[PDB]
Ligand binder design. Structure first.
Ligand SMILES: O=C1[C@@H](O)[C@H](O)[C@@H](O)[C@H](O)[C@@H]1O
Ligand SMILES: [Fe+3]
Ligand SMILES: [Fe+3]
Length: 241
């Protein structure tokens, strides 16, 4: 598998510190990079190949949405979750390097656990891992705080979650959560990070695993009007990114 995939994660696991994530929350927390509609966001990602993997990520938006739609035909909000879920990748078009945008996510501020991809080979130069506040199992966290109180590595999950919240998308809470934690492989697949999750995360786990099935070229022009209706329904108009 790619040397580029490995290099993406090496850079990610070096530079994603507590300070770094906090800096990125400040940098993007104003939503003044762009005014654009959801469909513009989808089309912008025509010019993005995901280096943590090939085709444009935009096709993947439709593919995912259509996979969910086949399996859950009467659940329109869930089809849209498919379309929306990787649109935080617009960060890359905003000048962000891909280790700060794509890839599996992991909590910052506590020791990385075994199922964090390339855990053994990629954390050497992370400065946080010699800081006694962050080098331990729990790090800066209290036991069983819940994932919504964890500071995750920064990229397309928290970013899109924040875009949705700011713009007041009218999706159910499960839709927000799926998107926010869909890259958190160590938790939803590795079953790591049990020290941090709560009952609330246990309730959400079946939703995330169900979504992940469809995350893991279509005739996209024919699909546009349907997905436009869903956008009009759940997240209409020019949004702040
Ligand atoms: O959209 C994505 C891609 O970046 C995949 O390569 C990751 O493995 C996944 O964790 C993430 O959700
Ligand atoms: Fe993703
Ligand atoms: Fe995806």
């Amino acid at each position: 598998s790619m040397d580029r995939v490995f290099t993406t994660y090496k850079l990610m696991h070096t530079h994603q510190t507590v300070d770094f994530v906090r800096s990125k929350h400040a940098q993007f927390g104003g939503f003044s990079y762009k005014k654009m509609t959801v469909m513009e966001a989808v089309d912008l990602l025509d010019g993005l190949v995901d280096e943590s993997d090939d085709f444009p990520n935009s096709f993947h938006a439709f593919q995912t949405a259509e996979g969910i739609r086949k399996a859950h035909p009467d659940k329109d909000w869930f089809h849209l979750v498919g379309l929306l879920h990787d649109l935080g990748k617009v960060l890359a078009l905003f000048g962000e390097p891909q280790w700060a945008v794509v890839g599996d996510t992991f909590p910052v501020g506590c020791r990385p656990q075994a199922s964090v991809v390339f855990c053994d080979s990629t954390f050497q130069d992370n400065p946080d891992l010699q800081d006694p506040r962050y080098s331990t199992e729990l790090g800066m966290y209290q036991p069983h705080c819940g994932l919504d109180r964890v500071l995750m590595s920064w990229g397309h999950d928290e970013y899109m979650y924040q875009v949705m919240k700011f713009n007041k998308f009218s999706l159910p809470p499960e839709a927000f959560y799926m998107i926010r934690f869909h890259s958190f492989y160590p938790w939803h697949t590795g079953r790591d990070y049990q020290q941090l999750c709560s009952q609330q995360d246990l309730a959400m786990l079946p939703w995330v695993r169900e979504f992940n099935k469809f995350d893991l070229l279509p005739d996209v022009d024919k699909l546009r009007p349907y997905y436009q209706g869903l956008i009009d329904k759940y997240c209409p108009g020019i949004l702040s990114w």
